[PDB]
Curated annotation (Swiss-Prot):
This is Ras-related protein Rab-23. GTP binds at V14, G15, K16, S17, S18, Y32, T35, G61, N110, K111, D113, S140, V141, K142. It is a lipid-anchor. Its main location: membrane. Regulated by guanine nucleotide exchange factors (GEFs) which promote the exchange of bound GDP for free GTP. Regulated by GTPase activating proteins (GAPs) which increase the GTP hydrolysis activity. Inhibited by GDP dissociation inhibitors (GDIs). It comes from Homo sapiens (Human). Belongs to the small GTPase superfamily. Rab family.
């Protein structure tokens, strides 16, 4: 079994806790203040004929921890409806690279189901991903869209 520690990072309310709950528990609650009462949730999947245990560590939205220590892959999340969360993506990337290193990382635009209230142009987000040289996914945690693909990509890149 290959165990992979992954950190989910991004500005407040972009959907980090919901993303981890969706992937590891298959739920999306109407909870007001969503919280994961433990350090990480996990999901054990088969990836390219191998047993993989993905351990997903939650973080706070606290820019200067045990979550980052030893991280082996990273999900950078911003929100379709939060302009500042998009503009903060480069800084979150620098924080992970400086504190952990150049680990496999995916850029995620969450809340794509709220596209009517979008404040990020498609060209803007794609151009950012190309500048940072990061795989880019548009996800909806609420509708379970492209969440599985994000973590499967990171697992595969850590293995290969
Ligand atoms: N419409 C929609 N709402 C979403 C989606 N993902 C999360 N949310 C909602 O956005 C809110 C914030 O989500 P949450 O997971 O708490 O975000 P967070 O990044 O963990 N916040 P914090 O940094 O404060 O811990 C919640 O009301 C949650 O239900 C999504 O894909 N679509
Ligand atoms: Mg949270």
């Amino acid at each position: 079994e290959v165990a992979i520690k992954m950190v989910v990072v991004g500005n407040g309310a972009v959907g980090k806790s919901s993303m981890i709950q969706r992937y590891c528990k298959g739920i999306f609650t109407k909870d007001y203040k969503k919280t994961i009462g433990v350090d990480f949730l996990e999901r054990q999947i088969q990836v390219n004929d191998e047993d993989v245990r993905l351990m997903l560590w939650d973080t706070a939205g606290e820019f200067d921890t045990k979550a980052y220590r030893g991280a082996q892959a990273c999900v950078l999340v911003f929100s379709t409806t939060d302009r500042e969360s998009f503009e903060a993506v480069s800084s979150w990337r620098e924080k992970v690279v400086a504190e952990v290193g150049d680990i496999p990382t995916v850029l995620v635009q969450n809340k794509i189901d709220l596209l009517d209230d979008s404040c990020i142009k498609n060209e803007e987000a794609e151009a950012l991903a190309k500048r940072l040289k990061l795989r880019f996914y548009r996800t909806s945690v609420k509708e379970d869209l492209n969440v599985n693909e994000v973590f499967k990509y990171l697992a595969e890149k850590y293995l290969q």
